[PDB]
Amino acid sequence: MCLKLNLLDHVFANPFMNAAGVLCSTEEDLRCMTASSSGALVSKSCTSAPRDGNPEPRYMAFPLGSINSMGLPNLGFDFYLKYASDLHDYSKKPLFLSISGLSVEENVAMVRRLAPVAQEKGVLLELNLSCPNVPGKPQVAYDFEAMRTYLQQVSLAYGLPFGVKMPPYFDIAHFDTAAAVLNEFPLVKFVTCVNSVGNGLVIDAESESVVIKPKQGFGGLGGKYILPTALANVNAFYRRCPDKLVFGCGGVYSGEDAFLHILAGASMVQVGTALQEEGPGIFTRLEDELLEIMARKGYRTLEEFRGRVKTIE
Amino acid sequence: MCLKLNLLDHVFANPFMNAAGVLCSTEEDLRCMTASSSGALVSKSCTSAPRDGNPEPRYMAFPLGSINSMGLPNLGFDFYLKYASDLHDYSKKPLFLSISGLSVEENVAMVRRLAPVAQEKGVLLELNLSCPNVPGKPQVAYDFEAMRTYLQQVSLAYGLPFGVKMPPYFDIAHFDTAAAVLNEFPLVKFVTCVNSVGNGLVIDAESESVVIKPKQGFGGLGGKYILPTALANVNAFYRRCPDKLVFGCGGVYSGEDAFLHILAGASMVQVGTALQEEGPGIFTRLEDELLEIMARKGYRTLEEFRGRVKTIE
Ligand SMILES: Cc1cc2nc3c(=O)[nH]c(=O)nc-3n(C[C@H](O)[C@H](O)[C@H](O)COP(=O)(O)O)c2cc1C
Ligand SMILES: Cc1cc2nc3c(=O)[nH]c(=O)nc-3n(C[C@H](O)[C@H](O)[C@H](O)COP(=O)(O)O)c2cc1C
Numbered sequence: 001m002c003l004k005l006n007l008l009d010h011v012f013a014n015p016f017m018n019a020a021g022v023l024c025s026t027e028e029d030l031r032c033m034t035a036s037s038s039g040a041l042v043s044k045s046c047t048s049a050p051r052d053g054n055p056e057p058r059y060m061a062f063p064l065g066s067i068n069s070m071g072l073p074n075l076g077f078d079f080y081l082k083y084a085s086d087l088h089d090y091s092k093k094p095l096f097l098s099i100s101g102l103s104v105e106e107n108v109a110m111v112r113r114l115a116p117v118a119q120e121k122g123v124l125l126e127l128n129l130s131c132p133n134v135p136g137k138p139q140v141a142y143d144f145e146a147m148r149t150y151l152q153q154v155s156l157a158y159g160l161p162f163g164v165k166m167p168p169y170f171d172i173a174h175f176d177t178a179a180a181v182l183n184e185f186p187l188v189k190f191v192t193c194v195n196s197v198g199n200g201l202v203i204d205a206e207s208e209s210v211v212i213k214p215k216q217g218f219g220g221l222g223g224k225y226i227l228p229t230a231l232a233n234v235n236a237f238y239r240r241c242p243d244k245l246v247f248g249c250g251g252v253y254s255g256e257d258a259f260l261h262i263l264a265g266a267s268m269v270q271v272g273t274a275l276q277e278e279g280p281g282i283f284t285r286l287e288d289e290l291l292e293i294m295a296r297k298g299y300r301t302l303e304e305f306r307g308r309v310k311t312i313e
Numbered sequence: 314m315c316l317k318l319n320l321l322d323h324v325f326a327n328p329f330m331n332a333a334g335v336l337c338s339t340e341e342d343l344r345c346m347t348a349s350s351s352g353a354l355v356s357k358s359c360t361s362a363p364r365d366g367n368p369e370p371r372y373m374a375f376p377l378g379s380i381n382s383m384g385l386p387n388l389g390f391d392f393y394l395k396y397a398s399d400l401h402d403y404s405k406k407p408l409f410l411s412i413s414g415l416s417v418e419e420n421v422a423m424v425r426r427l428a429p430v431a432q433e434k435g436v437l438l439e440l441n442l443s444c445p446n447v448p449g450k451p452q453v454a455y456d457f458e459a460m461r462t463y464l465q466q467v468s469l470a471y472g473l474p475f476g477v478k479m480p481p482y483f484d485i486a487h488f489d490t491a492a493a494v495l496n497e498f499p500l501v502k503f504v505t506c507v508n509s510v511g512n513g514l515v516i517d518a519e520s521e522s523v524v525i526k527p528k529q530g531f532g533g534l535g536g537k538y539i540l541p542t543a544l545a546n547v548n549a550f551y552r553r554c555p556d557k558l559v560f561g562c563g564g565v566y567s568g569e570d571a572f573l574h575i576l577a578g579a580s581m582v583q584v585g586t587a588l589q590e591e592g593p594g595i596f597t598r599l600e601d602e603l604l605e606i607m608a609r610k611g612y613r614t615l616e617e618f619r620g621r622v623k624t625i626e
């Protein structure tokens with residue numbers, strides 16, 4: 001029985017990795033994720049300049065998942081580029097670098113500088129499109145023309161295979177439109193579904209108060225709340241983007257949750273909230289649990305079941 | 314006690330009602346809701362003509378909620394109109410009729426017929442903006458120009474105060490645009506937030522299969538999965554629509570959940586999945602539990618806390 005994967009010209013011991021934003025902001029974090037039994041890691045979404053992010057409390061977790069409005073706190077692109085170029089031990093596992101510029105121009109500037117390092121060290125780009133552009137306009141991936149512009153500009157500036165981190169969608173028309181945009185861009189080799197379910201609101205009954213300070217308490221949802229939404233998006237894009245990989249993210253707490261992602265179409269499986277809550281020991285548990293389901297079903301490899309969710313009649 | 318309230322020129326014993334679609338399709342279902350302890354009832358969303366809906370299984374529930382692709386099965390507008398005109402006992406509680414035509418013209422045709430009944434009997438209209446997927450275009454409430462058309466045309470045709478059933482939004486710019494549309498229409502006196510979270514996908518690990526037959530397993534999510542989404546939409550519209558009422562729907566299983574909806578801004582609180590799962594006895598329990606939380610906090614009225622969720626700093 002094996003969890004090994006080969007994609008994007010890299011080898012991966014197993015499909016599990018952190019989700020961007022979790023356990024990946026500092027050099028300490030990235031060393032920790034490297035030391036863990038995950039098959040890969042991704043660095044925190046970065047901007048050109050370092051950011052403090054939003055005031056605290058800006059993350060909170062609960063039995064059914066988490067809410068956050070972190071505000072993109074990060075150490076700045078130069079830091080993550082140096083990590084990828086000089087610090088990361090690529091003999092341990094592959095590295096993804098997540099970028100999330102606040103304008104197309106900022107993204108272009110970063111990718112131009114990433115490219116030689118991607119070429120020479122093999123660091124892989126994850127471009128976060130589930131992010132803000134202009135206040136009063138929707139996030140980029142919810143604005144299809146903006147999304148097309150970002151991908152045209154980053155494809156030209158980078159010129160190397162990359163992937164994109166997508167928000168969840170809720171309307172089949174959006175699945176159709178979004179996947180068609182992505183399919184215009186041959187350098188988009190993987191699609192990560194999904195980022196948080198946007199602008200939820202958690203209220204504490206006792207205090208009668210929201211639980212995060214930014215945005216009057218509104219923030220992105222992760223965790224148990226979002227698994228079916230995550231699965232739908234993985235499968236929607238898996239069906240619609242046959243020449244790309246899909247990575248799954250959302251609601252993974254167990255090997256069974258990972259198995260469901262993989263049946264939906266996931267290649268890599270990212271872990272956000274559950275990793276935030278449990279710490280990097282989760283990876284050995286998820287590995288064991290996934291191998292146990294495979295053994296019971298007689299599956300020897302991931303490809304024997306990836307994308308093989310059955311439909312009814 | 315007591316949880317009695319007045320809205321929309323009607324008196325309600327308590328703020329609870331079924332969510333459209335649950336326990337409200339047949340005359341039997343409507344008489345069952347009327348006999349319950351709910352403060353109101355709403356009928357199944359109807360078309361001009363009867364519909365069988367989609368193939369079974371088309372609804373499934375789980376510990377965290379439900380998924381459905383019912384396909385708008387209903388007995389047709391003439392049936393619900395006759396129920397409102399002739400069979401409903403308005404001495405028991407108010408009745409809302411939900412309408413979900415597949416075009417503007419079909420809604421206009423139904424609402425012109427409903428108007429005299431509304432005048433004579435006081436039946437209330439909930440206009441459902443969600444609809445079956447049509448390839449090439451989004452649902453009506455995710456197309457702000459189509460939504461504006463629908464409300465212009467229904468406003469003109471109906472001429473009386475009515476409400477609208479909204480899908481969830483996930484983006485602050487969308488809240489701003491949708492609320493601005495709604496505020497163009499003075500006859501829209503209530504907004505019901507939210508319909509199911511669209512196009513989720515539940516997979517059964519043992520069978521390696523989706524759990525509903527239509528749409529390759531994709532369907533709307535309700536229950537525990539969607540409470541924070543529902544609260545955010547309730548509050549977003551409560552803040553943006555000061556001259557309207559907001560009705561909360563999504564994730565209510567307990568009086569605590571109702572309390573959170575009301576803190577967010579809800580006037581009425583609708584119950585879908587938990588009603589489907591527990592049956593109409595749930596209303597006595599929700600009432601008792603809400604009144605118990607009120608008493609422990611010192612609240613004598615719903616108005617003392619409606620909309621009074623606290624923010625940080
Ligand atoms: C604290 C926190 C920080 C996050 N920061 C990022 C980020 O910087 N870039 C991004 O692509 N996603 C970010 N996310 C989203 C996660 O990557 C992930 O898509 C989402 O949490 C869903 O997965 P989950 O259900 O495992 O949490 C963040 C999530 C959390 C909880
Ligand atoms: C079986 C079923 C049928 C539904 N049919 C309708 C409908 O006809 N019209 C409507 O506006 N919403 C309909 N809904 C959505 C619910 O009214 C409600 O918005 C949703 O289930 C979220 O509430 P909950 O979390 O309490 O389930 C239906 C929901 C279910 C589960």
Ligand SMILES: O=C(O)c1cccc(CCc2c(C(=O)O)[nH]c(=O)[nH]c2=O)c1
Nearest residue numbers: 069070071072073130131132195196220
């Ligand atoms: O700066 C923000 O307001 C903001 C809001 C939503 C998303 C982002 C991008 C970074 C990010 C964050 C974050 O840093 O808030 N949180 C998530 O759950 N996913 C993400 O992609 C930034």
Ligand SMILES: O=C(O)c1cccc(CCc2c(C(=O)O)[nH]c(=O)[nH]c2=O)c1
Nearest residue numbers: 382383384385386443444445446509533
């Ligand atoms: O026929 C459908 O695929 C469909 C999809 C979404 C919405 C509707 C309208 C009726 C409805 C249904 C339904 O009857 O399937 N289910 C819900 O959760 N909300 C609803 O508003 C019908």
